[PDB]
Amino acid sequence: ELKEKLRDVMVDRHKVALGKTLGEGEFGAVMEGQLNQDDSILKVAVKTMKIAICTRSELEDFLSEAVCMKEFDHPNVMRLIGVCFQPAPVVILPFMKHGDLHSFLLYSRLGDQPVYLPTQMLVKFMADIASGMEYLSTKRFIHRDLAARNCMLNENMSVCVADFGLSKPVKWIAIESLADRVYTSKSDVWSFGVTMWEIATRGQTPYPGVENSEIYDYLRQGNRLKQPADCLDGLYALMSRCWELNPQDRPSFTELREDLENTLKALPPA
Numbered sequence: 001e002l003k004e005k006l007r008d009v010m011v012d013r014h015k016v017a018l019g020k021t022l023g024e025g026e027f028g029a030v031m032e033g034q035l036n037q038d039d040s041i042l043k044v045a046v047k048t049m050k051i052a053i054c055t056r057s058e059l060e061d062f063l064s065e066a067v068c069m070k071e072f073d074h075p076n077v078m079r080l081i082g083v084c085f086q087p088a089p090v091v092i093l094p095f096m097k098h099g100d101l102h103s104f105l106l107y108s109r110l111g112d113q114p115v116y117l118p119t120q121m122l123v124k125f126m127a128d129i130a131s132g133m134e135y136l137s138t139k140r141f142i143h144r145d146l147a148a149r150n151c152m153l154n155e156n157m158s159v160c161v162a163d164f165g166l167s168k169p170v171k172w173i174a175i176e177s178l179a180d181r182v183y184t185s186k187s188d189v190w191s192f193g194v195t196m197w198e199i200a201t202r203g204q205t206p207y208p209g210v211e212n213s214e215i216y217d218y219l220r221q222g223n224r225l226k227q228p229a230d231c232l233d234g235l236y237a238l239m240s241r242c243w244e245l246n247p248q249d250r251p252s253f254t255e256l257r258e259d260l261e262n263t264l265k266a267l268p269p270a
């Protein structure tokens with residue numbers, strides 16, 4: 001009656017086969033994996049969190065969030081496959097062969113094979129995040145860790161929002177969230193403005209030369225991310241609106257999706 005949701009979210013550790021490591025972190029390790037989906041085998045991403053559970057309430061909260069994340073059904077939102085325990089929690093996600101959005105933007109210029117991404121492709125990436133964020137907003141979900149690095153690329157080169165701040169940096173957090181530790185969908189809008197800038201600059205570091213400890217004062221003194229020379233006044237106006245001091249002055253994710261889609265049809269395809 002109650003735990004019928006635990007039945008779905010749980011994944012048998014004897015059906016998961018680890019392969020090559022995809023990357024290392026401070027919060028865990030991620031590997032390429034094979035999931036025995038009874039009759040079929042599925043290529044997955046396996047994130048094992050280095051930080052183990054120490055209380056019943058911590059184990060309770062993880063499993064609640066996991067059920068919330070498995071309920072996500074949108075083309076621009078990562079669909080959580082399931083959860084394990086190595087107790088250290090494990091997370092099973094679909095295998096996204098094109099990797100994270102930040103790495104893609106960063107390798108486009110700073111790679112051995114440097115290809116210039118057209119403004120329309122960049123505006124579509126932004127539109128893809130706002131669509132997934134509009135979905136999460138309606139489902140009353142707060143991401144808390146929105147960034148190009150936490151955005152995945154589908155096989156159709158479509159972007160989808162991922163992570164969902166489950167491992168709960170500063171340069172994406174809204175001014176009110178740095179100050180009061182209060183998080184809303186309006187603070188997610190701020191983070192999205194930073195992400196749009198991250199896409200427009202093609203993976204540049206927000207606030208260069210500013211340290212995380214200086215960030216609150218830098219923002220508090222009125223400073224915001226400067227407009228890129230190659231970026232359109234209209235696109236930068238959308239960014240700036242997300243960084244408005246008063247959260248109620250910031251646009252909604254439905255508003256952003258519309259303005260981004262409007263500018264996208266005006267631009268060349270595809």
Ligand SMILES: Cc1nn(CCO)c2c1-c1cnc(N)c(n1)O[C@H](C)c1c(ccc(F)c1Cl)C(=O)N(C)C2
Nearest residue numbers: 022023030045093094095096099100103150151162
């Ligand atoms: C194929 C691949 N190459 N690379 C490195 C180049 O991008 C990665 C992946 C990969 C693929 N599919 C997944 N579902 C997946 N990871 O999920 C991770 C848990 C994940 C990240 C990063 C951000 C983020 F949003 C998530 Cl969900 C990660 O740790 N990576 C190592 C990214």
